[PDB]
Design a binder for these strands. Structure first.
Ligand SMILES: [Mg+2]
Ligand SMILES: [Mg+2]
Ligand SMILES: [Mg+2]
Ligand SMILES: [Mg+2]
Ligand SMILES: [Mg+2]
Ligand SMILES: [Mg+2]
Ligand SMILES: [Mg+2]
Ligand SMILES: [Mg+2]
Ligand SMILES: [Mg+2]
Ligand SMILES: [Mg+2]
Ligand SMILES: [Mg+2]
Ligand SMILES: [Mg+2]
Length: 158
RNA sequence: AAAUUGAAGAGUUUGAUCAUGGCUCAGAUUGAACGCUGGCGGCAGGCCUAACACAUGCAAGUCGAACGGUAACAGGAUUGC
């Protein structure tokens, strides 16, 4: 029903008196392609087990993002701990031009044409969180017409 | 009416993580050089170094409608007619 993508897999380790204990962590993003996207971070010891955990976490905890026929309403700046994310609406036919982590988020969310850039740290989990944060706070022209006392015509047509 | 439509990251410090941070690569480009190989055509480019030294040929001559003229031949009658 909804598209799901695996972004990154990493092998983490912890130290016990017996020795080193290893595990695999998988970051995935899911979305219906119609303005809903969620990210999940699974953590297990076997790679197939971890990716399933990530999908389960990503399947819930979704967010709703307004899309203007496959592009953003206005340019936005997503910021998380270390990663600075700048996204910008683009014309028809430009495609998804973004980093490896950012491209997966925008594809499953339904964004087709967009210009994006990542500044600072490019750690995949931080980048996707910033992209999620940068899209959830984006407001549609109806929303700004709701906060202010003017109708859609006055907001843009005027 | 148009004169435009525009932005990607990855590797590497750790037992593992985040950040900082340098290093390195994926691109475009050249008056190119070298290695291997090599069919045709169009188009352009071709001493970036010693403003180092130069054999030899050529690259600035025209004007008898300025003038005295006749040295070569071209003619007419030794003769510039
Ligand atoms: Mg690592
Ligand atoms: Mg950095
Ligand atoms: Mg780092
Ligand atoms: Mg990492
Ligand atoms: Mg680095
Ligand atoms: Mg080392
Ligand atoms: Mg050669
Ligand atoms: Mg041929
Ligand atoms: Mg020279
Ligand atoms: Mg000289
Ligand atoms: Mg000549
Ligand atoms: Mg003579």
């Amino acid at each position: 029903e909804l598209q799901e993508k695996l972004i990154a897999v990493n092998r983490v380790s912890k130290t016990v008196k017996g020795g080193r204990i290893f595990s695999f962590t998988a970051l995935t993003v899911v979305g219906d392609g119609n303005g809903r996207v969620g990210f999940g971070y699974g953590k297990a010891r076997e790679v197939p087990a971890a990716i399933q955990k990530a999908m389960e976490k990503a399947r819930r905890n979704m967010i709703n993002v307004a899309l203007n026929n496959g592009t953003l309403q206005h340019p936005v700046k997503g910021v998380h701990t270390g990663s600075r994310v700048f996204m910008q609406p683009a014309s028809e036919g430009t495609g998804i031009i973004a980093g490896g982590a950012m491209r997966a988020v925008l594809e499953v969310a339904g964004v087709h044409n967009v210009l994006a850039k990542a500044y600072g740290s490019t750690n995949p989990i931080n980048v996707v969180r910033a992209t999620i944060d940068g899209l959830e706070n984006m407001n549609s022209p109806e929303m700004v017409a709701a906060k202010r006392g003017k109708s859609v015509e006055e907001i843009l047509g005027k």
